[PDB]
């Protein structure tokens, strides 16, 4: 465990709440965003709607309320895997910002991409870091895919708290 400020917002140790985190597009209380726990499941298994993502279809989304003004250096994915048959997951997904919260921000990476890649591995968590970092209040999460499918996955902020 080499990092010092890369950690999670807390709730993955336990110290943030599940108002903080707020899932537009679950099904049920159990396959929720709050609930869904990145490197766990107290729910269901995973994160995931009651309908079909579409590269078209785009109206519910992820969103994540942080403490205070922080800086996500770092974020981490967990893809869906049930022994081959939850191989389902998010191949590719948005990582929207905003201060305020009102405002909603795409962030764009050095390669000129706003859009950042899904998960790599089928169960193992995935971690991407930020460059550059994203500074801010208020994070959101959409989903993104080269054609209609289903994903379930969940996601978490790292960084400097």
């Not at 140790?13 to 396959?31: F, K, L, N, V």
């Not at 994203?134 to 289903?150: C, E, G, K, L, Q």
Request: one cysteine or more; proline letters at 7%; a negative charge.
């Amino acid at each position: 465990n080499p990092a010092i400020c890369r950690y999670p917002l807390g709730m993955s140790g336990g110290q943030i709440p599940d108002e903080d985190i707020t899932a537009s597009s679950q099904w049920s209380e159990s396959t929720a965003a709050k609930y869904g726990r990145l490197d766990s499941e107290e729910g269901d298994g995973a994160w995931c709607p009651e309908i079909p993502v579409e590269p078209d279809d785009l109206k519910e989304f992820l969103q994540i309320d942080l403490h205070t003004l922080h800086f996500i250096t770092l974020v981490g994915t967990q893809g869906r895997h049930a022994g081959g048959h939850g191989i389902e997951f998010a191949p590719m997904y948005k990582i929207n910002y905003s201060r305020d919260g009102t405002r909603w921000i795409s962030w764009r990476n050095r390669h000129g991409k706003q859009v950042l890649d899904g998960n790599s591995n089928p169960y193992d968590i995935f971690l991407k870091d930020l460059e550059p970092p994203i500074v801010a209040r208020f994070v959101r999460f959409i989903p993104v895919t080269d054609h209609s499918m289903n994903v379930c996955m969940r996601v978490e902020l790292y960084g400097c708290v």
